[PDB]
Amino acid sequence: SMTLGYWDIRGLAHAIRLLLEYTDSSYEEKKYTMGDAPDYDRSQWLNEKFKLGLDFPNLPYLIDGAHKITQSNAILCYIARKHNLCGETEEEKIRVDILENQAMDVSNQLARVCYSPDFEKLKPEYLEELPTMMQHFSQFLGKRPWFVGDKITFVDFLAYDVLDLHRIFEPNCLDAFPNLKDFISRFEGLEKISAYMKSSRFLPKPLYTRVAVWGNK
């Protein structure tokens, strides 16, 4: 088995947590909690930072015996490798790379605004540019069922999560693009995914950590 560490928050973990589930990967949940109050006690994880012997201390981090890795993309990729959930042809592979970094780019964009007390100040600015943003995901998906082609890849996990984030932030987004709404259908109707969705250990929210103005819980 393998263990995955992070907080009991969705965060950058929700993508990996999806990937491991879809591939019947027998994993273990390593979640650390931080206090509320004025000084968000982030100890739980801190006292175990060094004890894991990670190259670069941080979470999410994956454990698979002589395999302990950090950095979100490194983890997703690695699980994808033993499943071929990466590109095959040069075209597929480049579309995977673009989308890879692009997904994380927009996740971060939304994060920055949500991790800023000036929330409502920047909130509209994001909401106004957002339509053009969503527009392109459809421009990319377009013809194929899965963002890269007819085959499912790890990037299709990144795409789902980032789509659901905005969906809850402002539901009135994907509607203008039935293309993007369709995607969130296949990637929900999947036997193993519906299973995980309707399971006891299904973690949707909190979106952001206690230190978030919005999405915190």
Next chain:
Amino acid sequence: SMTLGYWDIRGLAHAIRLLLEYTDSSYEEKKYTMGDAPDYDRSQWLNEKFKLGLDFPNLPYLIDGAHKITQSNAILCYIARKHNLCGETEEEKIRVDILENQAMDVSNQLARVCYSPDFEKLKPEYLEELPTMMQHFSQFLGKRPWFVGDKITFVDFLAYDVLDLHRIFEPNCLDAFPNLKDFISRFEGLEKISAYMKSSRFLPKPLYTRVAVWGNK
């Protein structure tokens, strides 16, 4: 010939101008210039932007004839691939995934600082944690000549970029881990790298865009 387009700023393309330089890739430079005044004008880009046909119109971008690869990382993966400077062995693949992203993490982290209003307030905090972050980089290289191991991969260029960045910022941050220093000197000593460095196309500064509280020019 492939076209490389980015602002007249070194920025993120700095690693790319080295990589395609090293791989003898027949490139051409499309520099877009930023304006000043209260509204730092970027019309040159805005006007072109959508015309180029990038699935996700962003700068820097690469148009290898019939290939419009956007986003630095995806660009790096693209060039490296065609010149096999990628992780060959599974253990190397993990090193490549970790380093690439980690180097990208710290670069944007410094980018968070130089792009935030209160530079001189947040700066001491970065210096406050700078050494420890650097430590880990030293660990990773360890005894190897190149971060991944015996061979040179794209992640070396990336690393060299992020390392040099911190050398102009704080000349003594790297002055604690000689292991990292030698790596740099080795990198610069590479025949087709020294030539570029003392060539009319070498772009070492401006570091940040013409709006950054630090690094702009």
